[PDB]
From a paper:
The heterodimer [name]–[name] (Ku) is a central factor of the classical Non-Homologous End-Joining (c-[name]) pathway, the predominant DNA Double-Strand Break (DSB) repair pathway in multicellular organisms. It recognizes DSB ends through its ring-shaped structure in a sequence-independent manner. Upon binding to the broken DNA ends, Ku subsequently recruits most of the c-[name] factors, including enzymes responsible for end processing (nucleases, kinases and phosphatases), for nucleotide addition (pol X DNA polymerases) and for ligation (the XRCC4/Lig4 complex together with [name] and PAXX co-factors). The metabolite inositol-hexaphosphate (IP6) stimulates c-[name] by interacting with the [name]–[name] heterodimer (Ku).
We report cryo-EM structures of apo- and DNA-bound Ku in complex with IP6, at 3.5 Å and 2.74 Å resolutions respectively, and an X-ray crystallography structure of a Ku in complex with DNA and IP6 at 3.7 Å. We characterize the binding site of the IP6 at the interface between the [name] and [name] subunits. The pocket is located away from the DNA, DNA-PKcs, ALPF and PAXX sites but is close to the binding site of the Ku-Binding Motif (KBM) of [name].
Residue numbers in the entry:
A (entry chain B): 6 to 170, 181 to 545
B (entry chain A): 34 to 534
The structure:
């Protein structure tokens, strides 16, 4: 339902040391928090946030008493985020000239979480750390720390200047900070972090250590706070006798901006003043208004117009049989072309939660579908009032789980049959052999994958599905800038956005020459008239 | 855009003779096909006009008064009365009705038939966008006894093609086999773009000829014509088309209570905000967050969604293996070269397509439909052309535009440990599924809502006794597969399900 998060910035002097060609890590982490809190504020979620700093010249921890946890300031307690937080983080925060043990910061954070979650649901608790591990520390309490974390069930993530493992364009994909440039204090810090986190989250733990530049192009910050979807209970039936209790979830759904714009007066900035009226009239000459009681709902049937009352519509409208997920048959996976996918979502189908019998049956079905390389054609009806759909269900096996995937398929009415002239049989368009060689050379240069370790695996050099919507970030930044600088114009797009929206410089550099060759070998000119 | 079609149909003794009892009358093929195309047009709610003319008739009817020519309909939008008129002729009973009222079998010159058709087009008033005439026949040498008639038909066809008409010949299965080479090779509207040695085969099945005619008749409706930018320098022009589109139920319109006149709002009256009216410049856009209000100009609103000029810019190439199918986001689009803007584009397009197919890799581009729209990452999947056994354009050559979800669109799966199944259960399911294997043609399932609603509208418009309750194909034939399954289901259940459930 409701989560609670606290952010642990390093504001240390070492944290702010900009090697030329790279921004100061303090600035990068500032950008990361800016993004995160922007999302939180403009998502208007109910999850309160807290901010604690270490490396400050002063200290404000509740445990600062006793001459410990010094240089640690609790800048903001667990409250709902606000524009004031944004203003403080962009302006009020300045790089402190102090270095402190981040473990002490963890102690302060766990204290804060324990002492501020009182009387609040807080279905989730999680902590982020933005440090460089450049400062030494004491390995004393870390055992107590991890024990308390396990007892209190507190998630954890680590963010560093460099990833675990040309110009270091922030937010780029390929390159990163020189792995050999680390000071070997960061080596020890990394070892401690790795062992702590592996103790916490197991072998998957080392998957939660992100570099700031890498962080900006991922949603890993929200990975531990996002409200999981809600299942859709239903049964699928093969024939009459056979049925299985299952649940389904929306795995892909086009995210959309929540709050639309509101038109208001230029003078009083009020939507209340403005409103719209309308009149109804016959389309014939001598336009005479038509009052609503002289208006009846009608329908067009080609050249024909038929009156049709809404009551008659309801009485004659098609009526389904209610929620259902029945199957129809099976066909070659080859038959179902990937391009015929229709609809605007996908459904991953799981065995109904906590049912060994359903799990066994569904797993057997999935394995049979896979081995036969078949797919299932189903009749899907979300609700009795919804239009029933027909779509393909195909097995999707995985090491840790297995599930069916459903995608709506189209009816004949949605198809369009256009005739296209072929290209291979076009004597005016057949490319020359040299042209083909040039194209092949380009496509070799402009590759995006790479066979790695000769393990025949293919490491992507550009995961687009890991990139989030740049529109949300741009919108949030513009809104925040206006909210803080009302008279100022809109700031341009941040450079790192263009970085994440572009392939690594290596492919472009290698493609420079073949592109020129193609430009020479393919005469292209515009059409002027017409 | 507003075009028209003429379904010219021959009425001869061959047209009423069935090759086999299982086979249906070619005339029946034609009339049912015409009913199909009208109902499809009504569903699509297009503006194209249509008309039907018969020749070889014992009794003629036409303005210009040529014998054996029956202008049964004038160019017009489809109407329910027209549909009933057509349905009056389907089936053997309808064939007998056609014999009695129309009468079939008579000499004729194709030249005068085309002359009548040209006159009928001349009768139009609106801007007729295209000019298509589709012929239905199983006779390959109409003027095997009248050489002068054949020559006159040849010259008339040449003129009409020069005039701007398109004539398309839907030949039918006949004893001996139709061959366009004998007479129509110079008659048909052969596309000058390429050598149409490839051509549709003899039509025998109603579904097959229906696919043929529907594919032939329509015109490509370019959704958009963008520029594919390889870099700042290399650029080509392509036409984004959509092959699938959810046919929503047509919206209702308001009507006068008594006269049933199509009424019009013709009014968007403002308030006293500015007094009666209001200037758009006085309308700033704002949004509220917490106790804070943020206000922007409309131009400012358009500005923050600006990333780059509309079009496709290429970032790189990726093997199809790395790309997934379960990562569906929205209906895919289709891409075809467009040399009406940049010359030589199709050459590069074709070379690139061939090389991508050879390498089994797809292009990855940054889509941008129109001005000031945030981009999506899309994969250009090469799509090799495929032809049916009947020479049907099953799969158009070109690049299939596929949207790729953003990390925001991606959701996580809450789950505990999974459980496998015993191999015997898997084999039982394999047998069960094999008992239900069936080939799937994409043109198999109709939307029940659309059909039922249109049946209701038909019954109201035709003032029938009751609306026909259209059967649903989507609803499973539960008893049918129960029969097809036998006792396998019970054995599987006892293998898996516990005695209590
Ligand atoms: O990085 P990839 O090899 O392309 O694998 C991704 C990635 O998984 P991993 O990085 O852990 O292998 C996704 O995880 P997220 O980055 O979205 O957190 C995962 O999603 P889940 O862990 O939720 O299953 C997704 O799987 P899918 O798209 O099936 O949901 C999966 O791709 P694969 O399906 O190829 O493993």
């Amino acid at each position: 339902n409701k989560a609670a998060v606290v952010l642990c910035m390093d504001v240390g002097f070492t944290m702010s040391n900009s090697i030329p060609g790279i921004e100061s890590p303090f600035e990068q982490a500032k950008k990361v928090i800016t993004m995160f809190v922007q999302r939180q504020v403009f998502a208007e979620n109910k999850d309160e946030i807290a901010l604690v700093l270490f490396g400050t010249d002063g200290t404000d921890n509740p445990l600062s008493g006793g001459d410990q946890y010094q240089n640690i300031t609790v800048h903001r307690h667990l409250m709902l985020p606000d524009f004031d937080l944004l203003e403080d983080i962009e302006s009020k925060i300045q790089p402190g000239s102090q270095q402190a043990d981040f473990l002490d910061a963890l102690i302060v954070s766990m204290d804060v979480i324990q002492h501020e979650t009182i009387g609040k649901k807080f279905e989730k608790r999680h902590i982020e750390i933005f440090t460089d591990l450049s400062s030494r520390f004491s390995k004393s309490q870390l055992d107590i720390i991890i024990h308390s974390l396990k007892k209190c069930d507190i998630s954890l993530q680590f963010f560093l200047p460099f990833s675990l493992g040309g110009p270091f364009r922030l937010g780029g994909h390929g390159p990163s900070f020189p792995l050999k440039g680390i000071t070997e204090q960061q080596k020890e810090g990394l070892e401690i972090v790795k062992m702590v986190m592996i103790s916490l989250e197991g072998e998957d733990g080392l998957d939660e250590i992100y570099s700031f530049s890498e962080s900006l192009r991922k949603l890993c910050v929200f990975k531990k706070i996002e409200r999981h979807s809600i299942h859709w209970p239903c049964r699928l039936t093969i024939g009459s006798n056979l049925s299985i209790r299952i649940a389904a979830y929306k795995s892909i759904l086009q995210e959309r901006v929540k709050k639309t714009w509101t038109v208001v007066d230029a003078k009083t900035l009020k939507k209340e003043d403005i409103q719209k009226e309308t009149v109804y009239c016959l389309n014939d000459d001598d336009e005479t208004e038509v009052l609503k009681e002289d208006i009846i709902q009608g329908f067009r049937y080609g050249s024909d117009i038929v009156p049709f009352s809404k009551v008659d519509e309801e009485q004659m409208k098609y009526k389904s049989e209610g929620k259902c997920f029945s199957v129809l048959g099976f066909c070659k996976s080859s038959q179902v072309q990937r391009r015929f996918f229709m609809g605007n979502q996908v459904l991953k189908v799981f065995a109904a939660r906590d049912d060994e019998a359903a799990a066994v049956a569904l797993s057997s079905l999935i394995h049979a579908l896979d081995d036969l390389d078949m797919v299932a054609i189903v009749r899907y009806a979300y609700d009795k009032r919804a239009n029933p759909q027909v779509g393909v269900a195909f097995p999707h096996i995985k090491h840790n789980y297995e599930c069916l995937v459903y995608v709506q398929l189209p009816f004949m009415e949605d198809l369009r049959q256009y005739m296209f002239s072929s290209l291979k049989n076009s004597k005016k368009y057949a490319p020359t052999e040299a042209q083909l060689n040039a194209v092949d050379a380009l496509i070799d240069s402009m590759s995006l994958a790479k066979k790695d370790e000769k393990t025949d695996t293919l490491e992507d050099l550009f995961p687009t599905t890991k990139i989030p919507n740049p529109r949300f970030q741009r919108l949030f930044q513009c809104l925040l800038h206006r909210a803080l600088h009302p008279r100022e114009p809109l700031p341009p797009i941040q450079q790192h956005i263009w970085n994440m929206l572009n392939p690594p410089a290596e492919v472009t550099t290698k493609s420079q020459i073949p592109l020129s060759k193609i430009k020479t070998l393919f005469p292209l000119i515009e059409a002027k008239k017409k | 855009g507003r075009d028209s079609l003429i379904f010219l149909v021959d009425a001869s003794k061959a047209m009423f003779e069935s090759q086999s009892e299982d086979e249906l009358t070619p005339f029946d093929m034609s009339i049912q096909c015409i009913q199909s195309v009208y109902i499809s047009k009504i569903i699509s709610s297009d503006r194209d006009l249509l008309a039907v003319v018969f020749y070889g008739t014992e009794k003629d009817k036409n303005s210009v008064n040529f014998k054996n020519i029956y202008v049964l309909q004038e160019l017009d939008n489809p109407g329910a009365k027209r549909i009933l008129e057509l349905d009056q002729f389907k089936g053997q009973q309808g064939q007998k009705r056609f014999q009695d009222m129309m009468g079939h079998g008579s000499d004729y010159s194709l030249s005068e038939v085309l002359w009548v058709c040209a006159n009928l087009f001349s009768d139009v008033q609106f801007k007729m966008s295209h000019k298509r005439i589709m012929l239905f026949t199983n006779e390959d040498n109409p003027h095997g006894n009248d050489s002068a008639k054949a020559s006159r038909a040849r010259t008339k066809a040449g003129d009409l093609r020069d005039t701007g008409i398109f004539l398309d010949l839907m030949h039918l299965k006949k004893p001996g086999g139709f061959d366009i080479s004998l007479f129509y090779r110079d008659i048909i509207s052969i596309a000058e773009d390429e050598d149409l040695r490839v051509h549709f085969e003899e039509s025998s099945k109603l579904e097959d000829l229906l696919r043929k005619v529907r594919a032939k008749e329509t015109r490509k409706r370019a959704l958009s014509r963008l520029k594919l930018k390889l870099n700042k320098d290399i650029v080509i022009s392509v036409g984004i088309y959509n092959l699938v589109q959810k046919a929503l139920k047509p919206p209702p319109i308001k009507l006068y209570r008594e006269t049933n006149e199509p009424v019009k709002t013709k009014t968007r009256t403002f308030n006293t905000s500015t007094g009666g009216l209001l200037l758009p410049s006085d309308t700033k856009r704002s949004q509220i967050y917490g106790s804070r209000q943020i206000i922007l100009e409309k131009e400012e609103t358009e500005e923050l969604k600006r990333f780059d000029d509309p079009g496709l810019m290429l970032m790189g190439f990726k093997p199809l293996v790395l790309l997934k199918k379960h990562h569906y986001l929205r209906p895919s689009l289709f891409v075809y070269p467009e040399e009406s803007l940049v010359i030589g584009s199709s050459t590069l397009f074709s070379a690139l397509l061939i090389k991508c197919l050879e390498k089994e890799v797809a292009a990855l581009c940054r889509y941008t439909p129109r001005r000031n729209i945030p981009p999506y990452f899309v994969a250009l999947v090469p799509q090799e052309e495929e032809l049916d056994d009947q020479k049907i354009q099953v799969t158009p050559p070109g690049f299939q535009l596929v949207f790729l979800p953003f990390a925001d669109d991606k959701r996580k799966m809450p789950f505990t440990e999974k459980i496998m199944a015993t191999p015997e259960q898997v084999g039982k399911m394999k047998a069960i599924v094999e008992k239900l294997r069936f080939t799937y043609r994409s043109d198999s399932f109709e939307n029940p809502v659309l059909q039922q609603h249109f049946r209701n509208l038909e019954a109201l418009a035709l003032d029938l006794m009751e609306p026909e309750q259209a059967v649903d194909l989507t609803l499973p034939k539960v008893e049918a597969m129960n029969k097809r399954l036998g006792s396998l289901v019970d054995e599987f259940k006892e293998l898996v399900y516990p005695p209590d459930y």
